[PDB]
Each structure stands twice: as structure tokens, then as C-alpha cells.
Amino acid sequence: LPPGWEKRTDPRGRFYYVDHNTRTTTWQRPTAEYVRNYEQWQSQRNQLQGAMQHFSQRFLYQRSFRWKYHQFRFLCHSNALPSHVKISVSRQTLFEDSFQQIMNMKPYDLRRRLYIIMIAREWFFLLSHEVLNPMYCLFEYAGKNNYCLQINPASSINPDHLTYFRFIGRFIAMALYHGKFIDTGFTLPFYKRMLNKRPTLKDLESIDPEFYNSIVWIKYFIQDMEILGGGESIRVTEENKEEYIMLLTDWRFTRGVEEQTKAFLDGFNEVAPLEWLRYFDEKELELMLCGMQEIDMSDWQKSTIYRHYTKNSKQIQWFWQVVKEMDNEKRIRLLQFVTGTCRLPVGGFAELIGSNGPQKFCIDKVGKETWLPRSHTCFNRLDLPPYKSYEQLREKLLYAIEE
């Protein structure tokens, strides 16, 4: 064990670890992996300072979603409660204080006019990041460099992880109720669950490109149903491929994280009934939580790369015309369809990241002219088929993204 750390024993007999050089505690043994991630994550907590000014520039509007969002904001401004709710925090204790104080209260009191003390937009922004602190063990990423947030299947290392997921639940819901934007980085598959929708095989590509490609070719227990080339070892045949893919796809989305997800929803619902989101889809829901940014086309255009196309190619030229005709909401919806998210990083389109590292936006000539445009989220890649009439593309583009 490295200098500064000790292995203490809580009065219930469980073992945790104290880092005396950073006055921190964690339930996890200090791997060289942990000191790596904690050191890195804290280096990113420092830069959070300046990025709050950029965050301020996120916005929503002052059946469509402009519609649906006013209907929602009304359902909240009506079920609201009188008075105020007071939270007090200090900068080295945003998480510890927030956590203990919000779980103390009955969930409805979180629907009063929240008064943070030490600033609300700062608080939701900061706390939305403080909960990814590796100290707590709740999350892991799926790609290099913080790309694809996921519940950590080994969260149980932290004996209290279900309570923490309930607090995040409560916290995400307060944001929706009181109308503030967060920055945690949940994926669309996670919003789909908040809406009782079933993640599909296409969604897997956002989360596990390699695993998705396996299911693409030729289409339980520690991964039941036997393949070569309930049932402890029932062979996968062409006369039961369909059910294998369906059972195994669901498995990849739920495995290891079923308790943690329930506790998240349980926490969300207490504060804002999950059925208040009946109207919304997964992309519209990420919009509310995250907020819209204004997409500027000149930035997008210099930073987009091409494959088999060129700046002056025929359909690549019609693509950007449909964009200029598009309004910012449709622009963001195009953004989500292709990158997986409505969140554009601080640098601009020049700095969007991907599964395997940095990855600018990419439009590729692929597919027959009878196809819709496809995307590959993990590569931020758009497949625009070689279309023949500009209005044909217009139809197929605006259809591919509105589904």
C-alpha cells in the first residue's frame, strides 16, 4: 500500500482505505489503476472552474418538443410546493453535504424553491460532476478518455452504493423539476430506461462496437445458450437465433447493474414521477437534462472530415444546405443521431471525442441510394448514401433523424 494510506476498519467490521495525503477515504483498495484515475479525475475537477462560464451558455426555450417542454414545465410549476428548501455546502464538501442533506429530507420538500447556501446553476453543474469521483466506485467508462458513461458492475465494492444511486436519482430529478442543466454524461440507452423503453441492438453500437459486431454477424447465464463456430447449455441453432440475439442484447444492457439502476429510478421517481415523461423520447429527455447549445454551421463545417466524399462532392453539398435550412433544435437532433449526444465540448466541433480517442465528425459515401443515412456513434460517423436528387436526401435525412 502506497505512502499516506492506511487500511482502517469500520465499526461494523468492513475494510475501507484512508488517503492521508489527500484527506480522502474510499472503500476501494488503492490499485495503481485507482491512483491513476483519481489523479486524472482530480486534474479534470480543476479545469471545471473555467468551463462553468461556457456551461452558462446552455439553454432551453424561454406534438412538438417546444410544445412538450412547456407542458412539462407547467406540470412542475403546478405540483410545486410552497416555501423554500435550504441546502448548505462548502467547496471541499459539495458532495458529502449535498448527499447527507438531500437523503435526510422527505422527497417532496425537494420540490420547494430550493435555496443552496455556501449558486444553484453552479451547484447542479459541480455536483453533477462530483458524483463521478472514482472515490465512490459508482461508474466506469466504455471508451478511452471518459467517453461512454456506464454504471460500474463492481459498484458493490462500495457497501452503500444503492443509497448513492438513490441520491443521484433524487438529484437528477431535482434538476428536471427545478429546471437546471447537468453534465454527468448519461447515454441515450440510460434515458431509454427512464422512459420504460427497451434498448435495441443498434443502441449497442454506441456502447460496445465490438460486441455489437459479433451479434451483427449471423443476425442465459455467464452467457448461456451454447454457440460453436432455462438451459445451462442449450445449443444456438438457426431455429432459435432470433431469441438468442434478443436475450443476449438485453443481457449486455442490464448485466451487473440491475440493482444500481433500480435504485436510481427509485430515487428519481420519489422526486418527480417518472410517468411525467410519457410524452418525451430519449433524445428529448437528454435535451432537458443537459440543455441546448446553439449549433453554429461554420464551426461544424471546417471540423467535419470525409470518406469517399469531398467538400465539393454533390451530396456533401446538399447535406450542408439541409443543415442551414434546419433550425438549431433539428441541428442538435442531427448532432445526437450521429454522435450519440446533444453535448458539444468546450472547444467546438474541432474537439469532439469518440470511442477510440479524438474523432472529428465524418460523412462517408456508403450504401445504396434506397437507404436511410446510418450512423456509427462510436466513430461519430455519418453514412450518407450516394443520393441522386437533393430533395430525396432532404426526405431521407429529415426522416432518419426524427425517428
Numbering used by the authors: 332 to 393, 493 to 548, 559 to 659, 671 to 680, 690 to 863
What does the primary publication say about this deposited structure?
To prevent excessive ubiquitination of targets and self-destruction by autoubiquitination, HECT-type E3s normally adopt an inactive state characterized by intra- or inter-molecular interaction.
Moreover, when WW in WWP2 robustly interacted with HECT (WT), the Y491AHECT (corresponding to Tyr543 in WWP1) and M575EHECT (corresponding to Met627 in WWP1) mutations, which were predicted to impair packing in WW4-HECT and WW2-HECT, respectively, significantly weakened the interaction between WW and HECT in WWP2, and the Y491A, M575E double mutation completely eliminated the interaction. Accordingly, the W358AWW2 (corresponding to Trp409 in WWP1) and H465AWW4 (corresponding to His517 in WWP1) mutations, which were predicted to impair the packing of WW2-HECT and WW4-HECT, respectively, significantly weakened the interaction between WW and HECT in WWP2, and the W358, H465A double mutation completely disrupted the interaction.
